[PDB]
Amino acid sequence: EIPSSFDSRKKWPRCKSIATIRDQSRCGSCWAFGAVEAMSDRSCIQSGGKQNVELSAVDLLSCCESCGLGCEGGILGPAWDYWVKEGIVTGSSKENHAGCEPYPFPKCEHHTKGKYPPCGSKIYKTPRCKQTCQKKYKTPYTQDKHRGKSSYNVKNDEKAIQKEIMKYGPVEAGFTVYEDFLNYKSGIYKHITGETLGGHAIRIIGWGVENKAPYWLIANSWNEDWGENGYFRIVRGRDECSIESEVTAGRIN
């Protein structure tokens, strides 16, 4: 039976990645962030906490040739296929500078107020695929790879998505971003004004209901200043902005 609310952070609190918000910086690498975040979560959840790692966004962003255009956007299915076939090494944020390949780009504000420099509208070139761990990290790049066993799209059905998240952990999901999404501060988002800005990719970690209004609970990759401490909520059950139609995940076993 599906509970009225669920929060992956509360079910698997040993897994540090689940409550970590990242920042893609001045790069359209959301496709890679939603992927490595959910893969980090799932690697920990599905291994009973034996894997408790932060997977490298830059490794996937830079090295996956079949995933699209890097900092100019990408494709979800091939990102999970890459994790299954090639694997992804470890790597923290830029400021944390941990793991094999930490992210090269700094935190910035994504169309919102706060303490980081504004992202602005310029975007970085996709980083090179370096295949080399940072000097202090004493495991060779190929030996730091973490691989999945399977990947799949999740059925476009609310209950199927809920069952998948509750059993196997957070999922990656695409949705259509409209201009009013950039004005989001808090609450349960739905598209009301503005034109399309294309597709975004995020990580769905749970769901809930407030004042009878059902929502998905989602981690964005725009740092902790954006939205509700880095998270947002969006209407659930009505395929709002295609949120129930682009879900992808995978398993280590």
97 given a catalytic annotation = no
Q: Is 223 an interacting residue with respect to Cl ion (CB under 5 A)? A: no
30 given a catalytic annotation = yes
Residues facing 200 on adjacent strands: 175
x/- binding map, residues 44-73, to Cl ion, per CB under 5 A?
-------------x----------------
Q: Is 105 an interacting residue with respect to Cl ion (CB under 5 A)? A: no
How far, CA to CA in Å, does 42 sit from each of 17, 63, 84, 117, 207? 9, 21, 13, 32, 18
Residue in 17, 43, 90, 93 binding Cl ion, rule: CB under 5 A: 93
- Please identify, among the stretches 73-81, 97-105, 163-171, 235-243, the one whose residues bind Cl ion according to the rule CB under 5 A: 97-105
Q: Is 103 an interacting residue with respect to Cl ion (CB under 5 A)? A: yes
Closer by beta carbon to Cl ion, 34 or else 243: 34
Concatenated DSSP letters for 69-128? -GGG-B-HHHHHHHHHHT-B-B---TTT--SSS---S---BSSS-SSSPB--S--PPPPP
Torsion of CA 79, 116, 189, 151, to 10 degrees: 10
Closer by beta carbon to Cl ion, 58 or else 173: 58
x/- binding map, residues 11-30, to Cl ion, per CB under 5 A?
-----------x--------
116 close to 108: Cβ distance less than 8 angstroms: yes
211 given a catalytic annotation = no
Kindly list the catalytic residues: 30, 200, 220
Report the interface residues with Cl ion, using CB under 5 A. 22, 57, 93, 103
